[PDB]
Amino acid sequence: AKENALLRYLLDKDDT
Amino acid sequence: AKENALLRYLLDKDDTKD
Amino acid sequence: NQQQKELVQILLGAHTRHVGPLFDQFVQFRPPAYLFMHHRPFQPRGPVLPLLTHFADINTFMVQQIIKFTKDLPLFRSLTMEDQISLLKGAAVEILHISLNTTFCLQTENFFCGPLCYKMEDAVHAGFQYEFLESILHFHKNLKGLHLQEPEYVLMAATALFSPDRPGVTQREEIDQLQEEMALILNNHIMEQQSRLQSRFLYAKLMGLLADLRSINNAYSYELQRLEELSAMTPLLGEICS
Amino acid sequence: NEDMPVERILEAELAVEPKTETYVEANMGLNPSSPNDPVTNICQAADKQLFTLVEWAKRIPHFSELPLDDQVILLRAGWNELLIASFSHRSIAVKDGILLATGLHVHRNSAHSAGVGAIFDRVLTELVSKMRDMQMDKTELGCLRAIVLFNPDSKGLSNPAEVEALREKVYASLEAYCKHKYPEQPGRFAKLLLRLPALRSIGLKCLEHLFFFKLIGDTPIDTFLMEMLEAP
Numbered sequence: 001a002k003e004n005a006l007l008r009y010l011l012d013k014d015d016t
Numbered sequence: 017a018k019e020n021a022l023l024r025y026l027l028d029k030d031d032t033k034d
Numbered sequence: 035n036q037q038q039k040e041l042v043q044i045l046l047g048a049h050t051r052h053v054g055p056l057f058d059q060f061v062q063f064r065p066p067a068y069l070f071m072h073h074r075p076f077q078p079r080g081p082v083l084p085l086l087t088h089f090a091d092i093n094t095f096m097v098q099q100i101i102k103f104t105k106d107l108p109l110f111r112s113l114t115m116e117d118q119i120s121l122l123k124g125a126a127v128e129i130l131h132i133s134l135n136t137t138f139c140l141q142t143e144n145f146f147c148g149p150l151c152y153k154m155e156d157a158v159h160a161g162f163q164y165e166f167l168e169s170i171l172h173f174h175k176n177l178k179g180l181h182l183q184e185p186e187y188v189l190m191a192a193t194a195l196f197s198p199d200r201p202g203v204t205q206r207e208e209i210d211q212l213q214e215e216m217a218l219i220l221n222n223h224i225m226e227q228q229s230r231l232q233s234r235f236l237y238a239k240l241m242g243l244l245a246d247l248r249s250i251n252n253a254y255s256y257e258l259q260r261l262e263e264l265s266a267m268t269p270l271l272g273e274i275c276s
Numbered sequence: 277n278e279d280m281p282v283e284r285i286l287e288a289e290l291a292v293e294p295k296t297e298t299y300v301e302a303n304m305g306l307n308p309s310s311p312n313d314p315v316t317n318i319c320q321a322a323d324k325q326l327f328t329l330v331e332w333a334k335r336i337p338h339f340s341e342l343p344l345d346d347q348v349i350l351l352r353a354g355w356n357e358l359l360i361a362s363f364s365h366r367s368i369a370v371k372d373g374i375l376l377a378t379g380l381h382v383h384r385n386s387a388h389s390a391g392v393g394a395i396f397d398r399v400l401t402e403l404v405s406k407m408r409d410m411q412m413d414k415t416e417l418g419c420l421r422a423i424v425l426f427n428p429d430s431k432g433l434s435n436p437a438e439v440e441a442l443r444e445k446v447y448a449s450l451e452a453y454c455k456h457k458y459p460e461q462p463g464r465f466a467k468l469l470l471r472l473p474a475l476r477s478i479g480l481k482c483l484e485h486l487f488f489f490k491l492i493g494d495t496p497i498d499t500f501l502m503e504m505l506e507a508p
């Protein structure tokens with residue numbers, strides 16, 4: 001799936 | 017809702033069909 | 035308490051009298067010959083019209099049987115006529131599946147109604163959406179996994195019947211009472227029948243399932259349109275969800 | 277603690293209340309350019325909270341330990357029910373209306389004039405009006421939403437079983453909290469769950485209106501909200 005990524009993106013760094 | 021008449025027909029009509 | 039055991043008694047009877055045996059009667063509606071077998075194959079060009087027609091016929095039959103069912107419920111027929119419509123239109127289909135589930139078999143995922151055996155293929159071949167049907171096989175596999183008892187099945191049905199959020203109603207407060215009353219009894223019956231089937235959150239699961247029915251029902255009104263013929267074939271089902 | 281520490285759920289709820297500030301720019305003047313369309317305001321809000329929603333889920337014990345694919349799946353699956361349940365519980369305070377995470381209010385009539393009454397009205401009686409009555413707390417709220425989040429039936433899931441089990445744990449943790457914090461309320465647990473079915477229909481109707489408003493153009497819908505509305 002090359003769509004529905006901003007979700008994925010945000011699910012990869014809530015640490016910061 | 018104005019519509020729904022088959023339903024109304026069905027609710028009352030006494031069952032035994034005839 | 036006591037008046038409850040009475041209500042359940044009332045329901046159970048209305049149910050066993052009007053719907054419990056609706057499945058054996060499916061042979062009255064021109065079921066295509068194959069449906070009598072448990073192993074096919076079928077004709078890739080074989081007229082689908084007959085099968086679709088059958089699906090519409092058994093549903094009409096099931097909805098009118100479900101109505102006769104509600105008529106045997108004083109608590110129900112004791113509501114505004116237009117209120118009874120909104121509850122029927124809102125839960126007829128839902129009650130149908132809760133009741134149809136008793137014919138569903140897990141080892142085969144097939145529906146067994148009398149001499150007949152309804153497989154998932156049949157529905158797809160009939161024209162319904164795979165996604166939709168898949169959501170239906172899911173509901174049934176789930177509900178059947180909980181190994182419910184006859185009192186819990188009808189109890190779950192009545193909890194769906196008396197739902198306030200159902201569009202079109204008016205005596206919401208009046209109906210809401212019936213539901214909350216219906217739920218308590220359902221839970222009570224569960225609790226007073228502890229472990230060794232448990233799955234404990236059995237009441238928590240049925241509430242899940244009542245939610246899944248919601249989605250499934252929300253899909254019917256959608257399928258009817260995407261299929262022209264059907265609508266005409268079965269006016270009643272078209273009225274119920276329209 | 278017990279895999280689903282009711283203690284961590286209420287914190288996840290308290291991390292993204294929001295809590296403070298979010299309602300100072302909406303209930304204290306603002307709005308760059310202009311915004312009076314209830315539907316649009318609701319849509320900008322939903323896009324806003326769609327982010328806090330990601331934060332949330334992450335703090336729900338065990339969520340983040342699931343495969344990346346699964347998290348995306350579960351969040352795609354119930355974002356609207358989760359979002360609705362939250363703003364509806366935040367609205368327990370307001371009169372005939374809801375309080376959007378941006379600070380703006382929306383009342384019964386405004387929704388009607390926007391043509392979204394009915395679905396808005398049932399939110400008010402099936403969710404807010406109901407949460408108010410039994411005074412459900414942020415812990416219970418978070419527990420229902422968690423339940424909503426862990427749905428084994430979403431398609432594509434890597435491990436339906438894991439998702440199944442986690443959900444059953446929230447059931448356990450919640451039933452417990454209820455039997456405790458509210459002993460004089462025997463059926464509270466069950467009364468809480470009764471919301472689920474109604475929350476589902478509302479969810480379904482909100483998606484319908486949403487898809488309609490998307491095709492018609494107008495009433496702009498920020499990204500993310502747009503990325504969740506691409507037919508599941």
Ligand SMILES: Clc1cnc(Oc2ccc(Oc3ncc(Cl)cc3Cl)cc2)c(Cl)c1
Pocket residue numbers: 089090093134145147152153154157162170253254255256257258264268271
């Ligand atoms: Cl006994 C039995 C009955 N139905 C079965 O399958 C179906 C088929 C279609 C459907 O949706 C619809 N069904 C009928 C109509 Cl008229 C409209 C829709 Cl949307 C719901 C269930 C199976 Cl597998 C067994």
Ligand SMILES: CC1=C(/C=C/C(C)=C\C=C\C(C)=C\C(=O)O)C(C)(C)CCC1
Pocket residue numbers: 315318319321322325356359360362363375376377378387392395396399482483485486
């Ligand atoms: C209820 C409702 C709608 C849908 C809202 C959705 C899907 C999410 C809202 C999130 C908010 C408002 C979150 C918050 O602020 O916390 C629409 C627009 C169709 C119209 C009015 C009723």
